[PDB]
Design an enzyme around this catalytic site. Structure first.
Site, PDB file in Angstrom:
ATOM      1  N   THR A   1      -9.129 -16.751  28.191  1.00  0.00           N
ATOM      2  CA  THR A   1     -10.519 -17.009  28.243  1.00  0.00           C
ATOM      3  C   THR A   1     -10.905 -18.196  27.472  1.00  0.00           C
ATOM      4  O   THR A   1     -11.988 -18.743  27.339  1.00  0.00           O
ATOM      5  CB  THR A   1     -11.524 -15.840  27.834  1.00  0.00           C
ATOM      6  OG1 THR A   1     -11.026 -15.413  26.633  1.00  0.00           O
ATOM      7  CG2 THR A   1     -11.401 -14.673  28.756  1.00  0.00           C
TER       8      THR A   1
ATOM      9  N   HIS B   1      -6.481 -16.163  19.315  1.00  0.00           N
ATOM     10  CA  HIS B   1      -7.067 -16.380  18.020  1.00  0.00           C
ATOM     11  C   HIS B   1      -6.498 -14.888  16.870  1.00  0.00           C
ATOM     12  O   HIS B   1      -5.931 -14.290  17.773  1.00  0.00           O
ATOM     13  CB  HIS B   1      -8.630 -16.569  17.903  1.00  0.00           C
ATOM     14  CG  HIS B   1      -9.575 -15.542  18.784  1.00  0.00           C
ATOM     15  ND1 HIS B   1      -9.581 -14.302  18.005  1.00  0.00           N
ATOM     16  CD2 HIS B   1     -10.302 -15.436  19.776  1.00  0.00           C
ATOM     17  CE1 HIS B   1     -10.157 -13.458  19.233  1.00  0.00           C
ATOM     18  NE2 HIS B   1     -10.642 -14.329  20.075  1.00  0.00           N
TER      19      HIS B   1
ATOM     20  N   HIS C   1      -6.296 -11.264  18.542  1.00  0.00           N
ATOM     21  CA  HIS C   1      -5.391 -11.098  19.441  1.00  0.00           C
ATOM     22  C   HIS C   1      -3.925 -10.869  18.665  1.00  0.00           C
ATOM     23  O   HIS C   1      -3.142 -10.293  19.172  1.00  0.00           O
ATOM     24  CB  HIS C   1      -5.097 -12.309  20.294  1.00  0.00           C
ATOM     25  CG  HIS C   1      -6.582 -12.568  21.145  1.00  0.00           C
ATOM     26  ND1 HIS C   1      -6.654 -14.050  21.014  1.00  0.00           N
ATOM     27  CD2 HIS C   1      -7.227 -11.928  21.908  1.00  0.00           C
ATOM     28  CE1 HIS C   1      -8.111 -13.824  21.774  1.00  0.00           C
ATOM     29  NE2 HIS C   1      -8.353 -12.675  22.165  1.00  0.00           N
TER      30      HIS C   1
ATOM     31  N   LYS D   1     -19.044  -6.122  25.841  1.00  0.00           N
ATOM     32  CA  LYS D   1     -19.539  -7.298  25.770  1.00  0.00           C
ATOM     33  C   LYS D   1     -20.922  -7.216  26.240  1.00  0.00           C
ATOM     34  O   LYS D   1     -20.983  -6.606  27.259  1.00  0.00           O
ATOM     35  CB  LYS D   1     -18.638  -8.501  26.739  1.00  0.00           C
ATOM     36  CG  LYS D   1     -17.261  -8.991  26.274  1.00  0.00           C
ATOM     37  CD  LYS D   1     -16.814  -9.906  27.021  1.00  0.00           C
ATOM     38  CE  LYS D   1     -15.428 -10.393  26.828  1.00  0.00           C
ATOM     39  NZ  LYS D   1     -14.809 -11.146  27.708  1.00  0.00           N
TER      40      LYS D   1
ATOM     41  N   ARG E   1     -20.175 -12.968  31.916  1.00  0.00           N
ATOM     42  CA  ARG E   1     -19.595 -14.192  31.695  1.00  0.00           C
ATOM     43  C   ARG E   1     -19.284 -15.036  32.914  1.00  0.00           C
ATOM     44  O   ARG E   1     -19.508 -14.505  33.973  1.00  0.00           O
ATOM     45  CB  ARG E   1     -17.852 -14.093  31.236  1.00  0.00           C
ATOM     46  CG  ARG E   1     -18.203 -13.463  29.802  1.00  0.00           C
ATOM     47  CD  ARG E   1     -18.393 -14.307  28.352  1.00  0.00           C
ATOM     48  NE  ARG E   1     -18.044 -13.807  27.242  1.00  0.00           N
ATOM     49  CZ  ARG E   1     -18.975 -12.937  26.408  1.00  0.00           C
ATOM     50  NH1 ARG E   1     -20.225 -12.448  27.312  1.00  0.00           N
ATOM     51  NH2 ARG E   1     -18.398 -12.523  25.417  1.00  0.00           N
TER      52      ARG E   1
ATOM     53  N   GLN F   1      -6.862  -3.776  35.546  1.00  0.00           N
ATOM     54  CA  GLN F   1      -6.197  -3.404  34.557  1.00  0.00           C
ATOM     55  C   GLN F   1      -5.329  -2.008  34.712  1.00  0.00           C
ATOM     56  O   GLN F   1      -4.207  -1.935  34.141  1.00  0.00           O
ATOM     57  CB  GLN F   1      -6.926  -3.503  33.033  1.00  0.00           C
ATOM     58  CG  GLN F   1      -6.072  -2.997  31.974  1.00  0.00           C
ATOM     59  CD  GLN F   1      -6.920  -3.567  30.656  1.00  0.00           C
ATOM     60  OE1 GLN F   1      -7.835  -4.340  30.667  1.00  0.00           O
ATOM     61  NE2 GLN F   1      -6.337  -3.089  29.316  1.00  0.00           N
TER      62      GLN F   1
ATOM     63  N   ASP G   1     -11.011  -1.644  21.889  1.00  0.00           N
ATOM     64  CA  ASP G   1     -12.134  -2.041  22.922  1.00  0.00           C
ATOM     65  C   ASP G   1     -11.461  -1.508  24.286  1.00  0.00           C
ATOM     66  O   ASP G   1     -12.212  -1.532  25.273  1.00  0.00           O
ATOM     67  CB  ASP G   1     -12.622  -3.464  22.838  1.00  0.00           C
ATOM     68  CG  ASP G   1     -11.767  -4.397  22.920  1.00  0.00           C
ATOM     69  OD1 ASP G   1     -10.432  -4.135  21.889  1.00  0.00           O
ATOM     70  OD2 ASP G   1     -11.438  -5.297  23.852  1.00  0.00           O
TER      71      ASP G   1
ATOM     72  N   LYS H   1     -18.582  -9.792  10.431  1.00  0.00           N
ATOM     73  CA  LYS H   1     -17.509  -9.974  11.419  1.00  0.00           C
ATOM     74  C   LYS H   1     -16.348 -10.579  10.985  1.00  0.00           C
ATOM     75  O   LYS H   1     -16.441 -11.642  10.050  1.00  0.00           O
ATOM     76  CB  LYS H   1     -17.942 -10.985  12.709  1.00  0.00           C
TER      77      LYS H   1
ATOM     78  N   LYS I   1     -14.744 -14.591  11.744  1.00  0.00           N
ATOM     79  CA  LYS I   1     -15.913 -15.355  12.026  1.00  0.00           C
ATOM     80  C   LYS I   1     -16.101 -16.285  10.762  1.00  0.00           C
ATOM     81  O   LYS I   1     -16.769 -15.950   9.703  1.00  0.00           O
ATOM     82  CB  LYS I   1     -16.936 -14.766  12.445  1.00  0.00           C
ATOM     83  N   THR I   2     -15.827 -17.639  10.790  1.00  0.00           N
ATOM     84  CA  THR I   2     -15.961 -18.626   9.617  1.00  0.00           C
ATOM     85  C   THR I   2     -17.243 -19.435  10.050  1.00  0.00           C
ATOM     86  O   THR I   2     -17.740 -19.357  11.135  1.00  0.00           O
ATOM     87  CB  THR I   2     -14.599 -19.374   9.439  1.00  0.00           C
ATOM     88  OG1 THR I   2     -14.232 -20.268  10.639  1.00  0.00           O
ATOM     89  CG2 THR I   2     -13.507 -18.788   8.914  1.00  0.00           C
TER      90      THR I   2
END
Ligand SMILES: Nc1ccn([C@@H]2O[C@H](COS(=O)(=O)NC(=O)[C@@H](N)Cc3ccc(O)cc3)[C@@H](O)[C@H]2O)c(=O)n1
Ligand SMILES: Nc1ccn([C@@H]2O[C@H](COS(=O)(=O)NC(=O)[C@@H](N)Cc3ccc(O)cc3)[C@@H](O)[C@H]2O)c(=O)n1
Ligand SMILES: [Cl-]
Lengths: 417, 413
Positions: free
Chosen positions: B39, B44, B47, B81, B85, B175, B196, B231, B234-235
């Site tokens: 995606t 990141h 993962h 989600k 998307r 999946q 998830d 979160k 998340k920066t």
């Protein structure tokens, strides 16, 4: 106005943008389609109403496309079906496809110029479509939120024990895509079907708009209901003579109730609305019972089974009524054994007494004696009063059949050996 | 028992038929897998935990299969989600597959005998599968009644405007079948993923029973949480990527240094290969944030990456920049400190205004006069000053600082 004419016959349940469609019909010839899935080796009366509607559109100058579901028959339409169906084999579905295509063909004109009928099969495009192509290009246009609330499948989502597989849930997209395909291939702008098909049709209208950017229409025919509330064609009444004999088929129409006969003439025959109204007015004003059931039986039996089939149905009806079976052929007796009258198996040399017991025409052998003495049993329409009577060698027609009758209407054909 | 060892690191959210999986693992090497969907052009920090778990299993002698979703990346996982998307093109997804495959590879051993890692791509089986075959052979085993009751899609099945397409709703079957397919190709008997992924994993376990009459297992890792409720990863800049061109090794190292004390010991367990006994011993103390930063930076960016991050951190703390290479100034320009592009000949007053370290030339003059400004770590208190050519390091960079902490890097045009 074709839509108005069909409405007057009671043949329109629902129609999308009635004004635009009627304007398109009045402008000139359109191409239209109806689909039929191979779930058996024959169509039945339920399928006949939209099939004849294809012919009514063709008679008005429009071009009918009769699609047979080579691909969709491998998936299974769940539309208003209480339970999941087992998947059929590729081999079985192919056999049924060929049988249904051949059964449909005589009902449409394949040789009347520009508007000549077309035979189609959705396996032509689904047989070589990749799953990712289907999920992306087609599936992205369907909202599961809308899909699960469709009347046709909503009830299957009440209990998991009486649920719906992803296979049957996907069906709606396959039928949707068929409409887009036929629009692209033949300029098909209308899809017709029975009322249970509304949701499958509307998915096809919406998908054609998303894929080919064309405006297409849908029209449904009502599902046949009887005025008394009982289920129609519950004796299924098949179109194949080896499933429902021309005689049983003819008798089914003869026994139509007075409340259904005029609606049925409209639905199942090509008689004009004026002739059907004249027949209803004649039955209303004659100081007698209706004659419309005879007209309906003749019309539909000739349409499905030809003049030969109608003449056999009448010849059989006559011989059973009169008692004289000399006019019946071996083929006529075969119709009777198939489904015309109740039948049983018995070895030659049987007394009239024992024939009546296994046929369920009598409870016991003791009862059989008194019933023969009362001159209540006939063998091939000839009154036989002797209790101690044995059948003669001439009485066993084609060395395999003898018709037993107790009273005026209780029959049993004995299939000898 | 490997399951018990993962449980004491807090790495086990859920596990199916746990006693049987523990017995299967104890008996000998198994083959397992985790899938990663393309995606983006990089993975990141989200993962990293299941990726490192594949390595944890391989260290115990098991055989990891790292799957990259070339087919599923064309469909879109809706699991937890909030919104649908947009579809990505086949060309974009393929580019991302190759980048992710290359990013994953160094984390696993592809040359260690029988348990060597395997790179898999589900496009190899779905890219050519006929739709009728998929609907009949796979879809018949799926109940829509069960599918709509999966926790992962419940938020999407209430309103059409926050709804789910047939495309994303079908994801669960793809999946599901991958697990059956890997079980058949490689004898894969375990699938791991973040929490998830539970519904997608359990559909694969069920499908493998229905298709191959084989018992397979599932294990999820928890979604990394922060004690303060915010979160994780998340920066201000967004996600913490593994790709050094998206998140520099310096920024990566700083993210770990600044871990809260309430998170640092839990993060050492999830993100490092340090023993549970050592982490517990470290907790008795803090050095933990420095240990976490050193370990994760070395793991993701190598020794060179860690050294660059440490060298930049030290130069920025000290103000002494002679140790910085041009590649180190490239990291600073990318995301290390605020930066401003300027034409050569600009004066010190203008650089302060343009960098927004000062609101006006008049104010900048007073701030310069007050001895608040350093140029490449050297104080400059002449308000009328123009930079010397020698202060454009590599003819390109000049680092300004206002007071003891506010940096701005000038990148000369
Ligand atoms: N008792 C019944 C049974 C069926 N019918 C009607 O007969 C027609 C054929 O019935 S059927 O074979 O069950 N039809 C189906 O399953 C349709 N889903 C076949 C189909 C249509 C379009 C297409 O692109 C692909 C396939 C449909 O239009 C029904 O609504 C009816 O009117 N009354
Ligand atoms: N913040 C996050 C983000 C992701 N992850 C976890 O990282 C892994 C990869 O994330 S992902 O790419 O979003 N994964 C998916 O979309 C999975 N559906 C990919 C997949 C798995 C198996 C398979 O056969 C095919 C495809 C999954 O196991 C996530 O649960 C996580 O743990 N925390
Ligand atoms: Cl200058």
């Amino acid at each position: 106005n074709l839509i108005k004419q069909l409405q007057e016959r009671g043949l329109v349940a629902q129609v999308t943008d009635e004004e635009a469609l009627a304007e398109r019909l009045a402008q000139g010839p359109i191409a239209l389609y109806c689909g039929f899935d191979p779930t058996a080796d024959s169509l039945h009366l339920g399928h006949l109403v939209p099939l004849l509607c294809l012919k009514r559109f063709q008679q008005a100058g429009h071009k009918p496309v009769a699609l047979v579901g080579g691909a969709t028959g491998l998936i299974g339409d769940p539309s208003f079906k209480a339970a999941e169906r087992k998947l059929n084999t590729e081999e079985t579905v192919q056999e049924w496809v060929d049988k249904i295509r051949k059964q449909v063909a005589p009902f449409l004109d394949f040789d009347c110029g520009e508007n000549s009928a077309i035979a189609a099969n959705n396996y032509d495009w689904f047989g070589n479509m990749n799953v990712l192509t289907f999920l992306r290009d087609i599936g992205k246009h369907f909202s599961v939120n809308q899909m699960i609330n469709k009347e046709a499948v909503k009830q299957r989502l009440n209990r998991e024990d009486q649920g719906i597989s992803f296979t049957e849930f996907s069906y709606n997209l396959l039928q949707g895509y068929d409409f887009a395909c036929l629009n692209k291939q033949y300029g098909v702008v209308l899809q017709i079907g029975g009322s249970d098909q509304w949701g499958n049709i509307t998915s096809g209208i919406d998908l054609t708009r998303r894929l080919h950017q064309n405006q297409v229409f849908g029209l449904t025919v009502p599902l046949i209901t009887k005025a008394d509330g009982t289920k129609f064609g519950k004796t299924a009444v098949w179109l194949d003579p080896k499933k429902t004999s021309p005689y049983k088929f003819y008798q089914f129409w003869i026994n139509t109730a007075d409340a259904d006969v005029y609606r049925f003439l409209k639905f199942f025959t090509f008689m004009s609305i004026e002739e059907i109204n004249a027949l209803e007015e004649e039955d209303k004003n004659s100081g007698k019972a209706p004659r419309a059931q005879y007209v309906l039986a003749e019309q539909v039996t000739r349409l499905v089974h030809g003049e030969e089939g109608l003449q056999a149905a009448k010849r059989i009806t006559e011989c059973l009524f009169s008692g004289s079976l000399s006019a019946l052929s071996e083929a006529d007796f075969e119709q009777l054994a198939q489904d015309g009258v109740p039948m049983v198996e018995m070895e030659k040399g049987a007394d009239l007494m024992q024939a009546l017991v296994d046929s369920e025409l009598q409870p016991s052998r003791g009862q059989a004696r008194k019933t023969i003495a009362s001159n209540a049993i006939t063998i091939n329409g000839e009154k036989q009063s002797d209790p101690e009577y044995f059948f003669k060698e001439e009485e066993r027609l084609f060395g395999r059949f003898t018709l037993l009758r107790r009273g005026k209407k209780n029959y049993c054909l004995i299939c000898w050996k």
